[PDB]
């Protein structure tokens, strides 16, 4: 859980749930409503 992934030399420290398609997710999770950051299974 310590190690995770999602312009040049940017560092976007935000973690807003993706409005990943046709839906105004805005805190809701589901189809087309995906949390952007994932752990590497190390």
């Amino acid at each position: 859980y310590n190690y995770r992934y999602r312009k040049p030399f940017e560092r976007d420290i935000s973690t807003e749930i993706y409005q990943a398609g046709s839906k105004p997710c805005n805190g809701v999770e589901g189809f087309n409503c995906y949390f952007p950051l994932q752990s590497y299974g190390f």
């Binding site: 398609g21 046709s22 189809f31 087309n32």
Partner: protein, 49 residues
């Protein structure tokens, strides 16, 4: 489910963007690109089952 086969579309137009809201995908998911963003594309056999 244990007896299906690789049917497909051929020689036709397509309109894949509708799968982003239509009841035919009321639950849905992908390995490939977003349904309307990829919706203009094509490949040599439209394999579907």
């Amino acid at each position: 489910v244990y007896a299906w086969n690789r049917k497909r579309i051929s020689n036709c137009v397509a309109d894949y963007s509708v799968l982003y809201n239509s009841a035919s995908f009321s639950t849905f998911k992908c390995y490939g690109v977003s349904p309307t963003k990829l919706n203009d594309l094509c490949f040599t056999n439209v394999y579907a089952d």
